[PDB]
Design a protein around this ligand. Structure first.
Ligand SMILES: [Cl-]
Ligand SMILES: [Cl-]
Ligand SMILES: [Zn+2]
Ligand SMILES: [Zn+2]
Length: 116
């Protein structure tokens, strides 16, 4: 049973891996995932997406100690990606970036959990 302090460091490392990741273009994969869209300008989004989430919210949850396991953060990352892949058309760059974020997260998780 790792301490809350140890868990936090792990979660921070996972988030960092996501937010520093770049595409071949050099663009940050995380760019369009930092902040949810305006409720005023994009009301359709909130009618369609039942549980909105963004990277800012996930970061806040890490700081709040809201997550009691790496799994809980992982489920939020899954949701982050699922929502983008629900509201946005497949093949789109946002769709691709959603998957890339998951790939980065789970690769980093494995690196951390399996290193010996
Ligand atoms: Cl495993
Ligand atoms: Cl494992
Ligand atoms: Zn394992
Ligand atoms: Zn090692």
């Amino acid at each position: 049973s790792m301490s809350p302090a140890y868990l936090k460091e792990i979660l921070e490392q996972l988030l960092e891996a996501i937010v520093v990741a770049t595409n071949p273009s050099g663009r940050l994969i995380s760019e369009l995932f930092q902040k949810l869209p305006s409720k005023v300008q994009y009301p359709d989004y909130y009618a369609i997406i039942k549980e909105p989430i963004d990277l800012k919210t996930i970061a806040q949850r890490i700081q709040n100690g809201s997550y009691k396991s790496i799994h809980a953060m992982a489920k939020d990352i899954d949701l982050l990606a699922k929502n983008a892949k629900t509201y946005n058309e497949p093949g789109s760059q946002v769709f691709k970036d959603a998957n890339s974020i998951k790939k980065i997260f789970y690769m980093k998780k494995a690196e951390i959990e399996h290193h010996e």
